[PDB]
Design a protein around this ligand. Structure first.
Ligand code: K
Ligand code: K
Ligand code: MG
Ligand code: MG
Ligand code: MG
Ligand code: MG
Ligand code: MG
Ligand code: MG
Ligand code: MG
Length: 117
RNA sequence: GGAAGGGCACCACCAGGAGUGGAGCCUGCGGCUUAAUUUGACCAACACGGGGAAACUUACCAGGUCCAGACAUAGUAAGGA
């Protein structure tokens, strides 16, 4: 249920628009201290990318979660075009995702907060 | 109709007034010139387009910006369009 909870929280944040995508924006948002959580994709070919993400998250004391596939993280971040037929096409991978505000409390928020802690 | 008859009009005349046409200047038109000298109009065009334009107006000419190219599909793309 942890993965489903994370997906639900990310989708609700996207609906509220309180989430950031990409490291170039992720570092800025995290340094603002407004980042309440960070999500990193495991499928990264740049060790410096993951090292910087982890170091910044640890330094700024921000909850960190990992995802196996970056394309799945991008899909959960809304970086796709939804077709009436079914799952959205034209997906683009998203290495990192950050959250500024959850908008409203949700069932998955509690599960995520319990897991990360 | 350089045919006849009847009638009528100061955008016709008669009887007259002011005149205009001549001079200087203002303003519109043609021509010429010009990078352009934007252009319509030739009784019923020509101080007309309410048109007396320094910029704007502006339509012309010599140059420099910008998209204020919705929407759909495809491509690129958060390792950033
Ligand atoms: K005279
Ligand atoms: K006139
Ligand atoms: Mg006369
Ligand atoms: Mg007379
Ligand atoms: Mg005279
Ligand atoms: Mg002229
Ligand atoms: Mg007449
Ligand atoms: Mg001009
Ligand atoms: Mg002018």
């Amino acid at each position: 249920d942890i993965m489903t909870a994370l997906q639900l929280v990310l989708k609700k944040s996207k609906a509220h628009g309180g989430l950031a995508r990409g490291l170039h924006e992720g570092a800025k948002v995290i340094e603002k201290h407004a980042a309440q959580l960070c999500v990193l994709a495991e499928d990264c070919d740049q060790p410096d990318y993951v090292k910087l993400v982890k170091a910044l998250c640890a330094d700024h004391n921000v909850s960190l979660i990992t995802v196996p596939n970056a394309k799945t993280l991008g899909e959960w971040a809304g970086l796709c075009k939804i077709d009436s037929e079914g799952k959205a096409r034209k997906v683009v991978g998203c290495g990192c995702v950050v959250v500024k505000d959850y908008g409203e409390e949700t069932e998955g928020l509690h599960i995520v907060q319990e897991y990360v802690k």
